[PDB]
Amino acid sequence: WDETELGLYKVNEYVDARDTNMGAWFEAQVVRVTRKEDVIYHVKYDDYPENGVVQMNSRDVRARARTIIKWQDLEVGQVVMLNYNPDNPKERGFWYDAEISRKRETRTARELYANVVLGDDSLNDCRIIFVDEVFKIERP
Numbered sequence: 008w009d010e011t012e013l014g015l016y017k018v019n020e021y022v023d024a025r026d027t028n029m030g031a032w033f034e035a036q037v038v039r040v041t042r043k044e045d046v047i048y049h050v051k052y053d054d055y056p057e058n059g060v061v062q063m064n065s066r067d068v069r070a071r072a073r074t075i076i077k078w079q080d081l082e083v084g085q086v087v088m089l090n091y092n093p094d095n096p097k098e099r100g101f102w103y104d105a106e107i108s109r110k111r112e113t114r115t116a117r118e119l120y121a122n123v124v125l126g127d128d129s130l131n132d133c134r135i136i137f138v139d140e141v142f143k144i145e146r147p
C-alpha cells in the first residue's frame with residue numbers, strides 16, 4: 008500500500024482488467040495504484056460493483072480494446088482479444104486473449120480457429136463464432 012503516481016495507468020483511468028480465475032477481460036477503472044513495471048492496480052469493474060475493489064498485477068491491466076481487426080486483416084499467428092464461450096462454444100461468451108491458429112474461407116462461409124488463453128492454460132483450436140468482432144490488443 009505505497010501509493011504511486013508512476014505506472015502506465017493512472018487513478019480514474021478507464022481500463023481493461025483480467026479476471027485471474029477465468030482469464031477473461033472486463034471493462035474496469037483504476038481506483039488506486041500502489042507499489043510492491045511491477046506496480047499494483049486496484050480496480051473496480053464497470054458492470055460488476057458487487058465484486059468490490061480488486062488488486063491487479065500490472066500484466067492484468069491494459070488500455071481498453073478499441074480497434075476491430077476486420078476479417079480480411081486477420082492472420083494466423085496474431086494474438087487478439089475475441090469472444091468465446093468455453094462451456095457453450097456456439098454461444099456468446101466473454102473476451103479472452105487468443106492466438107489465431109486457422110483461417111478458412113469459401114464463397115459463402117468463413118471459419119476462424121484460435122488457441123484461446125483461459126484461467127491458467129491454453130485451449131487449442133477453438134472454433135470462433137464472432138469473426139467480425141475480433142479486437143486488436145492495446146500495447147504500450
Ligand SMILES: CCN(CC)CCCNC(=O)Cn1nc(C)n2c(cc3sccc32)c1=O
Binds near residue numbers: 028029058
Ligand atoms: C463453475 C460454473 N460454470 C458453469 C455455470 C461457470 C464458470 C465459473 N463462473 C463464471 O464464469 C461466472 N463469472 N461471471 C462473471 C461475469 N465474472 C466472474 C468474475 C468476474 S470479474 C468481472 C466479471 C466477472 C465469474 O466468475
